[PDB]
Amino acid sequence: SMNPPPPETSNPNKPKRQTNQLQYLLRVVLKTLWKHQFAWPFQQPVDAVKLNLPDYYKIIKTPMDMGTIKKRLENNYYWNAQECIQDFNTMFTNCYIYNKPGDDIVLMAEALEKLFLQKINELPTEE
């Protein structure tokens, strides 16, 4: 019941690239979700200690959050757009796994997920 270390946000060994799709993911997709009213629960990694959820990291073995995703884009962690899209999807999947239907957190996640899918459908053409 101690928090795990947050996911890695910068790796010296990995090669670094800037693409329009990556610009769009940080600049449009991340920013739109970050500004949203329901954003706060997904803005940082779930703090199991502070929120007193002992079972959360036993159930969820691949934690992800928008704060982490924002840092990865900002640190040029992702070579590919799909890597970032996968992280968004993992964050939503985690919420649904841990939480029951009708929970406030699940409803918020669905709204964010819905908006995310709309923006991702507008993803710019790759190089």
Ligand X SMILES: CCCc1c(C(=O)Nc2cccc(S(=O)(=O)N3CCCCCC3)c2)[nH]c(C)c1C(C)=O
Interface contacts to ligand X, rule CB under 6 A: 40-42, 46-47, 50-51, 53, 56, 95, 98-99, 105
Provide the minimum distance between the beta carbon of 119 and ligand X in the complex, in angstroms, as a whole number.
20
Q: Which is nearer to ligand X, 21 or 94 (CB)?
A: 94
Pick between residue 105 and residue 120 the one whose CB is nearest to ligand X.
Answer: 105
Cα 53 from chain centre: 20
- Residue 102 is given by DSSP the state T
Shortest Å, Cβ 21 to ligand X:
26
Distance CA 43, CA 49 (A): 17
Name the residue nearer to ligand X (CB basis): 26 or 53.
53
Task: Say if residue 24 is exposed, middle or buried (CB neighbours under 10 Å; 0-12, 13-18, 19+).
Answer: middle
Query: Closest separation between CB of residue 115 and ligand X, Å?
Result: 16
Please name the helix (run of DSSP H) or strand (run of DSSP E) that holds residue 56, with its range, or none: helix 56-59
CB of 41 to ligand X, least distance (A): 4
Question: Which CB atom, from 97 or from 117, has the smaller least distance to ligand X?
Answer: 97
Determine contact, residues 37/52, Cβ cutoff 8 Å.
no
